[PDB]
Amino acid sequence: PKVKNLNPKKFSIHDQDHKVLVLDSGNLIAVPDKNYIRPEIFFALASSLSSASAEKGSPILLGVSKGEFCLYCDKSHPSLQLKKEKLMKLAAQKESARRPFIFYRAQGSWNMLESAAHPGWFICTSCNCNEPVGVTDKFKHIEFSFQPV
Amino acid sequence: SPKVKNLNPKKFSIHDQDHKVLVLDSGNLIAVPDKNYIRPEIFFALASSLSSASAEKGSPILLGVSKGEFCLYCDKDGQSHPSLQLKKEKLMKLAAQKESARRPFIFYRAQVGSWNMLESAAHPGWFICTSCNCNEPVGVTDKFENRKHIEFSFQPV
């Protein structure tokens, strides 16, 4: 019986200001990339949504700390958060439960990550260093370079 | 009388007592905040000897960076004060050099509990220090406002 291998894509995330994503006291921040910096390694899994349009990107789940914590976007304004949950146990949840954790990926060498639970809200980094990673509906700082390891 | 000199380096990261760790940035030693995403610089250290040293000074040591490919030294480069510098020299070569050649590279290690003070042998009264600010170079000073900037812990790899 044919089954999907479901191997997570392992990569670091760099923005256009050469800042890299790292985990600082349980929070995601963007820091100038340096030789002494250990970038956070993200684990990505394809996770389908039944309602999705043919023009949509590829729906994925995003994990951090060896896939022990998963990114979600939920609500005044929606915000990017981390939940202690194993990536593969999350992949096994029902559509409705996975939806807050799903992001749509749009790839030349750049990638955009749009929230599935809150369309129009994209994962972003600040112009400034050592600031948290968030979501934005205002469009420069949402194009990310995915570098594998 | 010449004391016993070591050839098998001690390997460790250096942290100040004000939440900073030492790293190499474009050939310069700097202290950055001590966080999980930081790859600390791994120092190579050797016990050395200095016959001219007086009774009160700590243990004479040599300190290297980048697997002992660069060695720390202290000198007055028509400069007013001594400064902390790096020379491209193998730590193993430096250890087997004559005393007069090693002297600028010797630092006296004084241990207080789990912390360490490091004094220039070439410039006594000048101690290795970090700034109160992050991402600044590591230097030498004969004056301090905060002891946490001249006290260092040596963490094993």
Swiss-Prot record, chain A:
The record's GO molecular-function terms, alphabetically, read: cytokine activity; identical protein binding; interleukin-1 receptor binding
| Record note on modification | Proteolytically converted to the mature form by CASP1.
First and last residues shown, out of full length: 50 to 206 of 218
Family from the record: Belongs to the IL-1 family.
Q: How does it assemble?
A: Interacts with SMAD3. Binds IL18R1, but not to IL1R1, with lower affinity than IL18, and does not seem to act as a receptor antagonist for IL18. Interacts with cargo receptor TMED10; the interaction mediates the translocation from the cytoplasm into the ERGIC (endoplasmic reticulum-Golgi intermediate compartment) and thereby secretion.
Domain of life where this protein originates: Eukaryota
Task: Describe the function of this protein.
Answer: Immune regulatory cytokine that acts as a suppressor of innate inflammatory and immune responses involved in curbing excessive inflammation. Signaling can occur via two mechanisms, intracellularly through nuclear translocation with SMAD3 and extracellularly after secretion and binding to its receptor composed of IL18R1 and IL18RAP. Suppresses, or reduces, pro-inflammatory cytokine production, including IL1A and IL6, as well as CCL12, CSF1, CSF2, CXCL13, IL1B, IL23A and IL1RN, but spares anti-inflammatory cytokines. Inhibits dendritic cell activation.
Give a Gene Ontology cellular component term annotated to this protein: intracellular membrane-bounded organelle
Instruction: Give the disease association.
Output: Inflammatory bowel disease 31, autosomal recessive: A form of inflammatory bowel disease, a chronic, relapsing inflammation of the gastrointestinal tract with a complex etiology and a multifactorial inheritance pattern. It is subdivided into Crohn disease and ulcerative colitis phenotypes. Crohn disease may affect any part of the gastrointestinal tract from the mouth to the anus, but most frequently it involves the terminal ileum and colon. Bowel inflammation is transmural and discontinuous; it may contain granulomas or be associated with intestinal or perianal fistulas.
**What is this protein identified as?**
Interleukin-37
Keyword set for this entry?
Cytokine, Cytoplasm, Disease variant, Nucleus, Secreted
Tell me which tissues or organs this protein is expressed in: In general, low constitutive expression, if any, in healthy tissues; high expression in inflammatory counterparts, including in synovial tissues from individuals with active rheumatoid arthritis. Isoform A, isoform B and isoform C are expressed in testis, colon, placenta, lung and lymph node. Isoform D and isoform E were found only in testis and bone marrow. Whereas only isoform A is found in brain, only isoform B in kidney and only isoform C in heart.
Its GO biological process annotations read: cellular response to lipopolysaccharide; cytokine-mediated signaling pathway; immune response; inflammatory response; negative regulation of interleukin-6 production; negative regulation of tumor necrosis factor production; regulation of inflammatory response
Provenance organism: Homo sapiens (Human)
Q: Where in the cell is it found?
A: Cytoplasm, Cytosol; Nucleus; Secreted
Q: What induces it?
A: Highly induced by bacterial lipopolysaccharides (LPS) and TGFB1, more moderately by IFNG, IL18, IL1B, TNF and the dinucleotide CpG (at protein level). Constitutive expression in bone marrow macrophages is down-regulated in the presence of IL4 and CSF2. Induced by phorbol myristate acetate (PMA) in different cell lines.
